[PDB]
Amino acid sequence: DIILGIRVQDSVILASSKGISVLDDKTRQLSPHTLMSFAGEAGDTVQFAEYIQANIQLYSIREDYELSPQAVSSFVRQELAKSIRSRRPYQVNVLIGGYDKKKNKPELYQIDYLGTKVELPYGAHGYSGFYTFFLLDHHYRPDMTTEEGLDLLKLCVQELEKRMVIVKIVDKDGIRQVDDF
Amino acid sequence: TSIGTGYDLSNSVFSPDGRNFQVEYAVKAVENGTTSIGIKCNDGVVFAVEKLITSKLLVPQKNVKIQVVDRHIGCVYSGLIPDGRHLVNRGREEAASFKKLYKTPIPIPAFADRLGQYVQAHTLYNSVRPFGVSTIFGGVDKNGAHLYMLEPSGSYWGYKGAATGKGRQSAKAELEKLVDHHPLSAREAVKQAAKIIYLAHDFELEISWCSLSETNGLHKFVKGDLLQEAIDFA
Amino acid sequence: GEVSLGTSIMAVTFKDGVILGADSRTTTGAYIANRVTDKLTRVHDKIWCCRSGSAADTQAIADIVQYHLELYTSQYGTPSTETAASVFKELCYENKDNLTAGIIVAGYDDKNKGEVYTIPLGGSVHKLPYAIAGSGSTFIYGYCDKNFRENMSKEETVDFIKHSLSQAIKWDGSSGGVIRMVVLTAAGVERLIFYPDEYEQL
Amino acid sequence: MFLTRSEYDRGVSTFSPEGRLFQVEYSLEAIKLGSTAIGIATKEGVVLGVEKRATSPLLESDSIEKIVEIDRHIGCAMSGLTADARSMIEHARTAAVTHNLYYDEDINVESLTQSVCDLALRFGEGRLMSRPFGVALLIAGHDADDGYQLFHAEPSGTFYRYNAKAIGSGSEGAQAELLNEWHSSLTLKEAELLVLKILKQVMEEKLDENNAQLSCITKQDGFKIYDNEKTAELIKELKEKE
Amino acid sequence: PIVTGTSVISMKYDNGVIIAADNLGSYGSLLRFNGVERLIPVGDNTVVGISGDISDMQHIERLLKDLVTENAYLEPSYIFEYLATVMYQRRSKMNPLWNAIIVAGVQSNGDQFLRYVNLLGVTYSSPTLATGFGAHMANPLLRKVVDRESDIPKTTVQVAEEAIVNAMRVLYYRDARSSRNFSLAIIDKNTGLTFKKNLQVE
Amino acid sequence: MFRNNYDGDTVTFSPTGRLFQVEYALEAIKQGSVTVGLRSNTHAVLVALKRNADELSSYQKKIIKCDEHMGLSLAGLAPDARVLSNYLRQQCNYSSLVFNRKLAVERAGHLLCDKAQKNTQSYGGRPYGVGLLIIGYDKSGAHLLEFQPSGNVTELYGTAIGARSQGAKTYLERTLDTFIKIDGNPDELIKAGVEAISQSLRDESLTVDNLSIAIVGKDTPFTIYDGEAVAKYI
Amino acid sequence: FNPYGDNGGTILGIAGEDFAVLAGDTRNITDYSINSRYEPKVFDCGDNIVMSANGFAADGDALVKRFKNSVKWYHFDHNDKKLSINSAARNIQHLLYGKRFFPYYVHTIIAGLDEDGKGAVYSFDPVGSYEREQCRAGGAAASLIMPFLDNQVNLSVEEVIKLVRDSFTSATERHIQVGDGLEILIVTKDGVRKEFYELKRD
Amino acid sequence: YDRALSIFSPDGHIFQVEYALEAVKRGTCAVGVKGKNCVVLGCERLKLQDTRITSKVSKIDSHVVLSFSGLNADSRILIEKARVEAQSHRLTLEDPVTVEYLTRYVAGVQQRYTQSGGVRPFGVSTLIAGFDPRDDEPKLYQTEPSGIYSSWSAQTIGRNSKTVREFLEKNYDRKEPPATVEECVKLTVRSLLEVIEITVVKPDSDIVALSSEEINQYVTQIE
Amino acid sequence: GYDRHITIFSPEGRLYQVEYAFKATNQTNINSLAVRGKDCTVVISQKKVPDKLLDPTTVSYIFCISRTIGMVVNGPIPDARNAALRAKAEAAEFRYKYGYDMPCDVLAKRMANLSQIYTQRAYMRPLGVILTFVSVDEELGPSIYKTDPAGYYVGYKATATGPKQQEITTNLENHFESWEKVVEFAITHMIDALGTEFSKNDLEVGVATKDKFFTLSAENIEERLVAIAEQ
């Protein structure tokens, strides 16, 4: 259960790791230009992701407008905190990556299980949060382009599997699936 | 003025003269019932009823109109049947509750107040109608005999002699003479109570009484020779 | 951290009334928070309550009983000591799972003269000619039985209570101070106070 | 002895002299507005037939549903305010399914109609509704305790076991003919023709497979609503026999 | 529990039932209240004997007094089922009555009745019943008199009474929480409910 | 004329003290079919004339069993009969579970009395339009109770309620001295009841379909004779 | 507080080719003390239905009580029609399953004739789960009974009653909680028949 | 009988519910036409109005659409409840709401508000159009304040409804329904000219609001 | 229209239903009088039975609300007894909540505030009684506070109520050590104002002192009348 996020100069790259064998886990499309990736407890984490998708979709239908990624991230933070009020906290980690059409700039946000929101150039959770910062911090640059980012992700993922993913990109063209890790 | 058109179609409404006509109408329902009287004696009280027999099909022993709210309380009402029996059961509940809590029979003045509040509570809101029964009740307690008579308005007082029903004016007039003539023993009143009912009046005579001396404070009916003696006196 | 009432309390019916007596010391552990406490609580003019166990629950219950009795008094006149005990039982019993209350009720009424009702922590009600409760009562159970007599006079009962509580005070340090006593009689409520210099040497 | 307005009909809880409850009686007037529904009970199965009453030609007559399946061996035909009916059918479906869950047995239709009438009874004490149902439904079902049976459930809360019943518009005419024509030895096939024959008289417009649909209850087949092709054949056979 | 009554014993004989209980309410190791009656007559034909928490016993007592009051506007089985329902329901509410109850009585048809019910709602009948410490001491002794149903007609009042009293003496000697004073009730189909008070164990 | 202004609901008393809205409910029983009830010292019998909505419809059920020892008949509004009968049955079963006693016939009729009298005092609800004839047999013995919607329950040797019930009542009064002495003869008692209901007929004759009969006693738990079983009594 | 007790004993159900049998001992037990020697552990619910809930008696008696009430309600709603064994099984499952998070600790068995007339026996898991079984036993000495029967069964209603007698006779020999009396209920199209046999007293 | 929802008229219909329909007849005209594989919705539309912050056709979901006639305020709230149900069903269940399901729910809300004398029923009749998920069969439904929902091949509600429902009845053949987007659009436009905004919904959540309908108007007008 | 049957403003800006409640206070045809002494407050009230059968003992319009507070009601007694139980319970609750005896004025405020509810709520009718609370407050000394169905409450140095309150009040205005003296003073002006001689059966008296409020018995009243005759 690894989720990654890289904020390149014109897009956001989200990656996720996959009894029952198949041939889109830990992700939900909140909006055409917004993507949400989550990791944590099975079950308690998907209902929250499904609920968030409904509310954001409901807002889009009601207003016929694309809610900005910053607003979406704030909404998730309040709902996650509101969820924990009357129950014991549950291990959840959400990455919200979206392209702000109004500002024409990508954005990536990280939300912890306690409901704290961080705007990040890059982020990770799980086993990827122990060493991968040593690589991204050394190699990441602000003006990195999409094609460069996936070399970094392909590089990064390579270290992850040495010490040991489905990849999506959000851009002005919308969500996009990728086979080149 | 006895109709009060305009202010009489709803309960809990004051007429320009301050009267609540719905309560007054409930009084008229009382005046159509069988006359019932209650006599307060030096040692107890006496109740009499002109039960108008309707048909032979009624079971004589189970057709009793002088209700017993509690072992030491006798109750007789005139007016609407549903309200009279509804009030008796509610009064029966209060008597049991008081005994349950304080482990003593409920005093008559306290019992009357509890009924008065319930009856009066139905004159406050338009969703309910005032009870259409004037209830004569009494008994014996630590302070002696008590006879009370609550109206549909919820007003009740202690009485030396009470009367209700259609045969009310005649019974009250004769009842006043009895008090004036003998200002009674539990024995004597039973004969006098029978006399008043016959004067007031096919009807049968039902009589009950409760006295400290002749019934050690319990309420019992009049039967057998005593009954016949009262009829003979009447 | 709840404050438990360290007490040595006693009620004794006598010829023409009842006497309620108690110490004046309340302790938190080994410390004496107050040594002039008035443990004799009035629930009615002729009915007086005394509390054992937790000081919070009993104080709350005592206020309710006084409220209910005042409510009863306005309707059916002055209540009996039996009625007050009944009120205590309802509160003490139905809340036994939450309230830790032990009570002694002593009162005077025309119908029953003096009466004493003791309500241990279990919530049961027991009518007795005399009653003793509190931590210091465990040390005089064998003295009150040997010396108590029925239909005693005021002087004997006052002396009897003085001797009884002097020993409980002597052996129990949770109880001590001044012996405050209430004499309930048809003449009226009377208050007595005995200082240590008056009863210790007995 | 003056003429004055009387308001014993407006209220629902207001008794009139002689004890008539008019609002319930006015509810039956609503049924007469509904489309005609016919039901005949006999051996080999029960048969239901309903006028669809197409408001306009553009209306999807193939989607007008006056007959609804409550249990695999029970069927209901409704007439009147269809909006109120949906509340009753939903309750009936739940009760039948609930009975199977609780007893592992098909609900007895005599018990089902009792449950439904308990709902229509709710305008008073079982209150959940302000006014009585403006729909009268006709239950046809087969339970293996009493055999193929037909029940008519009025909004008043009373159900009757009917050999043959007609409700809705023209019910008075339909019932009069059913009295002339129904008999114990009525086989299912002629009952289906009979239902169509009754619909012919009381239906104001032409009888056609598009505006009339039949249904039947059979032990082997259960509740089934006839296809348009079969109804056309039966209508064709009917006019040939006439 | 805080204040507890130790034991009740009973046995059915040819013409009725006998039930006995000692008049003591124990405050732990302290024999505080030696005046607690624990046999509750509920009419002319039945007695309810209660052990365990005395405070809960007094709560049972009123329900029995309410039962006669509400009805008067009873049978031994009638009363037991009311109690068993309460005891079961209090258990289901996780708020039990800490008591063991023996309902002894004679039915209007002459059938003898003896049923036991405890805080858990467990119920059983037997020729002889005892609660708490009496289940191990008296019950073996009484069973020697009536070991089976066939022995019921062969046991007279005197034999049953003697066995009950003898069981109390053995019970008193070896039971620390017992008292010399006990109450004994005899219910007979002919002579009705006979109720004996403050008997002395000797 | 003036009645229209004061008959709006069961809360307004008329200037003469009459409560019209509940009088109409009593009059609603006359719309129902005639049912006859009578009892001897040891046996009680119910006889009812069922009606069908149409010749193609089954005759409506008119007699119900609350337990093996007592039952009842119905006359008046169907919906009210549904509510009251099942509510009473909810009380037969309730007592056994918690207490394991048979609910006595007298108590059964009186617990229902409180239900009807509430509707005559509050706005919104309406008085029940159904009358009941309850028959049972308990320790005390035979019982026959007639419940009116006005909360009036009367112990009766025999009675008749419904359309043209006066004729049956007259016959029962004329034969009260006879059918009470029919003790230990359940067959003869029913024949008297069937004869009693026959006087209420106008056009329709007795048939195995429309007629229903019930009987209960010491040796007879509540049994309902309907269909071919009723042919002999006709 | 522990809301759950134990009473021991054993029950056995056998689904004959046509007839059905339900058997159980009559002894009621609490921690080595015999509460009573004859408590009917097997019940008849009518409609050719015999029911028995082993384990905690207060849970068992309630379950049969509610089930019997459900049968009465079923009769009222279904024109007094007979209740099928399968219908009762699912009805009991809902009763058992209606208290999952606070369940009955009873291994109950119902025996009867299915629609076609063959013997029927259903055993219910305490949380409701049931399965049709040819023969089943539950309780303390259940493990000592089934193996013996399986040898001799895997037969009329007079030769199986021999094996059940010997089976329980064997269990009482080596097991202390097995009762001093055997109850057997026989279900056939004729009806329900109760047979009792005596066992060892100690 | 007119002044309450809980009272039946002697002839057997509730007048108050009927009076809600006349409110719909006072509303702006709405039209709907079912093609072989498409559905077309047309609606009836001051100088100083801000036309860039106004569409009478509000979509309840990606694949469902809902036009209305009558009181605009009531419709705006009825639409909101439908939108929430569409997502709630998409949440509790996985599949999107069936078109028949949504109209049943919307009609239920209107029917529900008729079950009390203290509530004004919605004076709006909805015209729900759309395609079932993963289906190519067009579905058009109409709901009324009374709570009755019906399936229509072509329907018009509001101002000038009878005149427009007569034009459709003769020009629309259930056995010869239009089989092209242009054909149904022309019928809808011709329907509205008998007295312009046109919306076309196509399977797989393809909803487009047409612009430059003047070509069809010019074409239809010449003919 | 509706303004006549429910308590809402009429076009004249007045609540007719509340004003009709005032006229109901005179239905009993009983008038009262309350005056203040140096250390005690005394209230007088007529006891027109008038029926011979009616027992005069139970005919009392004076209620002992609390230990120190008593109130006299003018109007129908069924409404008076309902008011008494309200005041009889408000006083007890105040002591429970605030730990000291209910003052006279605050009780009038609570009862008056309750009456204000009936004058504003459409479905609640005004009680229709006039309550005259008399007590000796430990702070303000003797005090008289009178409440009316309109919701007003005013303190009085001396007040009279009933059909002939104007006749009584005018005499007090002209006029303006033990409670027995004020009782005689109050009775004398009632006789002078009304002109009707009084007996024990026709009069009921209530006295409020520092310790408690009590109602004089029939024999006690006769003694005061005898003392007046000595003048």
Curated annotation (Swiss-Prot), chain A:
Matches recorded under SUPFAM superfamilies: N-terminal nucleophile aminohydrolases (Ntn hydrolases)
Cysteine disulfide links: none
PROSITE patterns: PROTEASOME_BETA_1, PROTEASOME_BETA_2
Cell cycle among keywords: no
Primary location group: cytoplasm
InterPro entries: Ntn_hydrolases_N (IPR029055), Proteasome_beta2 (IPR035206), Proteasome_bsu_CS (IPR016050), Proteasome_sua/b (IPR001353), Proteasome_suB-type (IPR023333)
Annotated positions of the Phosphoserine modification: 68
GO biological process, one term: proteasome-mediated ubiquitin-dependent protein catabolic process
A single GO cellular-component term on record: proteasome core complex, beta-subunit complex
Keywords from the named record: Acetylation, Cytoplasm, Nucleus, Phosphoprotein, Proteasome
GO molecular function: endopeptidase activator activity
Localisation: Cytoplasm; Nucleus
Record-stated family: Belongs to the peptidase T1B family.
Miscellaneous: Present with 21800 molecules/cell in log phase SD medium.
Known function: Non-catalytic component of the proteasome which degrades poly-ubiquitinated proteins in the cytoplasm and in the nucleus. It is essential for the regulated turnover of proteins and for the removal of misfolded proteins. The proteasome is a multicatalytic proteinase complex that is characterized by its ability to cleave peptides with Arg, Phe, Tyr, Leu, and Glu adjacent to the leaving group at neutral or slightly basic pH. It has an ATP-dependent proteolytic activity. This subunit has a chymotrypsin-like activity.
Name by which UniProt lists this protein: Proteasome subunit beta type-4
Organism from which the protein derives: Saccharomyces cerevisiae (strain ATCC 204508 / S288c)
Organism phylogeny: Eukaryota, Fungi, Dikarya, Ascomycota, Saccharomycotina
Gene field: PRE1
From Swiss-Prot, chain B:
GO CC field: nucleus; proteasome complex; proteasome core complex, alpha-subunit complex; proteasome storage granule
Additional detail: Present with 12000 molecules/cell in log phase SD medium.
Function summary: The proteasome degrades poly-ubiquitinated proteins in the cytoplasm and in the nucleus. It is essential for the regulated turnover of proteins and for the removal of misfolded proteins. The proteasome is a multicatalytic proteinase complex that is characterized by its ability to cleave peptides with Arg, Phe, Tyr, Leu, and Glu adjacent to the leaving group at neutral or slightly basic pH. It has an ATP-dependent proteolytic activity.
Keywords: Acetylation, Cytoplasm, Nucleus, Proteasome
Subunit structure: The 26S proteasome consists of a 20S proteasome core and two 19S regulatory subunits. The 20S proteasome core is composed of 28 subunits that are arranged in four stacked rings, resulting in a barrel-shaped structure. The two end rings are each formed by seven alpha subunits, and the two central rings are each formed by seven beta subunits. The catalytic chamber with the active sites is on the inside of the barrel.
Family the entry assigns: Belongs to the peptidase T1A family.
Location of this fragment in the whole protein: 2 to 243 of 288
Superkingdom of origin: Eukaryota
Gene behind the chain: PRE10
Residues recorded with modification N-acetylthreonine: 1
Protein name: Probable proteasome subunit alpha type-7
Organism, as annotated: Saccharomyces cerevisiae (strain ATCC 204508 / S288c) (Baker's yeast)
Curated annotation (Swiss-Prot), chain E:
Keyword Nucleus in annotation: yes
Location within or outside the cell: Cytoplasm; Nucleus
Keywords recorded for this protein, A-Z: Cytoplasm, Nucleus, Proteasome
GO BP term, pick one: proteasome-mediated ubiquitin-dependent protein catabolic process
GO annotations of cellular component type: cytosol; nucleus; proteasome complex; proteasome core complex, beta-subunit complex; proteasome storage granule
Quaternary data: The 26S proteasome consists of a 20S proteasome core and two 19S regulatory subunits. The 20S proteasome core is composed of 28 subunits that are arranged in four stacked rings, resulting in a barrel-shaped structure. The two end rings are each formed by seven alpha subunits, and the two central rings are each formed by seven beta subunits. The catalytic chamber with the active sites is on the inside of the barrel. Interacts with CIC1.
Role this protein plays: Non-catalytic component of the proteasome which degrades poly-ubiquitinated proteins in the cytoplasm and in the nucleus. It is essential for the regulated turnover of proteins and for the removal of misfolded proteins. The proteasome is a multicatalytic proteinase complex that is characterized by its ability to cleave peptides with Arg, Phe, Tyr, Leu, and Glu adjacent to the leaving group at neutral or slightly basic pH. It has an ATP-dependent proteolytic activity. PRE3 and PRE4 are necessary for the peptidyl-glutamyl-peptide-hydrolyzing activity.
Residues of the full protein shown: 37 to 248 of 266
UniProtKB/Swiss-Prot annotation, chain I:
GO biological process annotation, one example: proteasomal ubiquitin-independent protein catabolic process
A single cellular component GO annotation: proteasome complex
Organism: Saccharomyces cerevisiae (strain ATCC 204508 / S288c)
Subcellular localization(s) per the UniProt record: Cytoplasm; Nucleus
Gene symbol of the encoding locus: SCL1
PROSITE patterns, sorted: PROTEASOME_ALPHA_1 (PS00388), PROTEASOME_ALPHA_2 (PS51475)
Name of the protein described by the UniProt record: Proteasome subunit alpha type-1
Domain of life: Eukaryota
Keywords, comma-separated and alphabetical: Acetylation, Cytoplasm, Isopeptide bond, Nucleus, Phosphoprotein, Proteasome, Ubl conjugation
Family: Belongs to the peptidase T1A family.
Note: Present with 15200 molecules/cell in log phase SD medium.
PANTHER family attached to this UniProt entry: PROTEASOME SUBUNIT ALPHA/BETA
First-listed, main subcellular location of the protein, grouped into a coarse class: cytoplasm
Cross-link Glycyl lysine isopeptide (Lys-Gly) (interchain with G-Cter in ubiquitin), where in sequence: 212
Keyword Cytoplasm belongs to the record: yes
Function noted in UniProt: The proteasome degrades poly-ubiquitinated proteins in the cytoplasm and in the nucleus. It is essential for the regulated turnover of proteins and for the removal of misfolded proteins. The proteasome is a multicatalytic proteinase complex that is characterized by its ability to cleave peptides with Arg, Phe, Tyr, Leu, and Glu adjacent to the leaving group at neutral or slightly basic pH. It has an ATP-dependent proteolytic activity.
Disulfide pattern: none
Phosphoserine modified-residue sites: 217
InterPro entries: Ntn_hydrolases_N, Proteasome_alpha, Proteasome_alpha-type, Proteasome_asu_N, Proteasome_sua/b, Proteasome_subunit_alpha6
